[PDB]
A paper describes a structure:
Surprisingly, Group 1 [name] displayed strictly OR-type enzymatic activity and acted solely on Galβ1-3GalNAc-β-pNP. [name] in Group 1 had the simplest structure among the enzymes analyzed. The active site of [name] possesses a cleft shape that allows oligosaccharides to pass through to the −2 subsite, enabling oligosaccharide binding and OR-type β-NGA activity. Furthermore, three characteristic tryptophan residues (W197, W218, and W249) are located in the subsites −2 and −3. A docking model of [name] with oligosaccharide suggested that these tryptophan residues may play a role in a stacking-type interaction with sugars located in subsites −2 and −3. This structural feature indicated that Group 1 enzymes may act on the inner regions of longer sugar chains, in addition to disaccharides from the non-reducing end (e.g., Galβ1-3GalNAc-β-pNP). By contrast, no inhibition was observed in Group 1 OR-β-NGA even at a concentration of 100 μM (green). This difference in the inhibitory activity of Group 1 enzymes can be explained as follows: the monosaccharide reaction intermediate-mimicking inhibitor (GalNAc-thiazoline) does not bind tightly to the substrate pocket of OR-type enzymes. The increased number of residues could potentially reinforce substrate recognition in Group 4 and GH123 enzymes. Additional structural analyses (comparison of crystal structure with AlphaFold2 predicted structure of [name], comparison of apo1-form and apo2-form of [name], and comparison of GalNAc-thiazoline-bond form and GlcNAc-thiazoline-/apo-form of NgaAt, NgaDssm, and NgaP2) data are illustrated in Supplementary Fig. 13.
Numbering used by the authors: 9 to 223, 232 to 512
The structure:
Amino acid sequence: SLSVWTASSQERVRQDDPAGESLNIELFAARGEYESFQVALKAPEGEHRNVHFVVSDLKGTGDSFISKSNLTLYREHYVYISESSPQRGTVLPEGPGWYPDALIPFIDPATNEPPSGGELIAVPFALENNSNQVIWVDIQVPRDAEAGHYSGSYIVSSEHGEVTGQISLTVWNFELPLKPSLKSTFLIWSSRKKSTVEELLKHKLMCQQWNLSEEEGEWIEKYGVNCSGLGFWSKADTFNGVMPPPPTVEEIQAAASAHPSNLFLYNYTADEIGHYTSLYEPIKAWARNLHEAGVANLITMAPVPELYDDGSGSGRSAVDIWVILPLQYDKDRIQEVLAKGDEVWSYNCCVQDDYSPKWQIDFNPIEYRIQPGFINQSLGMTGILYWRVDFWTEDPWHDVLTLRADGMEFNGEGMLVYPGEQVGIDGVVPSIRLKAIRKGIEDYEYIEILKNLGHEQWALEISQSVGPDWHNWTKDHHKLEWARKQLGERINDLMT
Ligand SMILES: [Mg+2]
């Protein structure tokens, strides 16, 4: 009458999926890393109306433990998609239906206690309809955790049953830096709360406030902030091939002085202005001034040889951080700009090709993880951008069709967090897709550690087995987990 099973972090559990074969879980992680798993529940006969869920400490040798304080629990909320995202090529969405995505937190981060009052509450819950309920479990490994094996439990209980499963965790003898190696720019347009920034930083994502009106050292020390934008927006975009004269060298220096002097600074100058060759000399004029002031120029455009020199005589490109879609990738031009000292980042939106990972709810969950980590590393890319995180509809917990344009509908476009009000909290809550992006950032970190230990070629051979390019990446979470384990076991070996 009470069927319980586990699923890996990037395995989608549908409401109608059959019970799996294991109720235990075996995980592996470094210090300073998250690993996650899911507990799925089904009532194949009747109803349990009052279901609770708890976890224990993870016990290691003797007295040794990882506290349950390091585990974060949520109940998955399913949202109904009535209109598919675009269907093209071989990378297709899974069809209209119920999708798990919003995460109902057991604990309000502001109180460290359960919410009350919410329209939706994590626990207790009812198990109905033969229809699955799913608990998401995050484990954060403490930076001081001794390497070795730890075991704890989860307990599912109701008025008519109780089932207990094992959580096995092996902690490897290495640590992910607090400051992530992968840089990012995720934009926030409407939610000005400190809690919204904080929710992103906790998932290893760097964010910038967009569209601010005229009216951090802590976040660095706590969350390892690794870059910051200065916010001189030229206003030039895909529809506006026009640019004003640049801020002056000392104007750029003045904005920069509001940040710590050790923090990597960029400027998001212009957006998708690639077709406007009109703008090359103005771009070079902006670049020369940023360069004199020690600031990187970031534009969402593909490398063009005309901009590989800023006209200052130094040889330096006019764009320092080239931000491209998967479909724009050109091996020869990317190798040229990497070789001369630039960065290339990836970004994603809509459904613009037949083959690339796509960022909508109705695609395979793996697509949010595979881009920042394995594919970026295989192609030498060092960052990720996303245009918006808070693009909510009027009914954000029930309607995720966030963009309708040109006969197409997009489910989750520009939307990675949900407002807290519906669950009785102030401030936003994560989605399952945000957890995948976090995991990809940690995947990127594994490869970076191996490069730094002098094992770049082997690391990239492993990276090419699951994420070699934008066309031939794995759709199988089991194979991705395998690849990651190979990396972690090698690092562990090298550090012992
Ligand atoms: Mg349609």
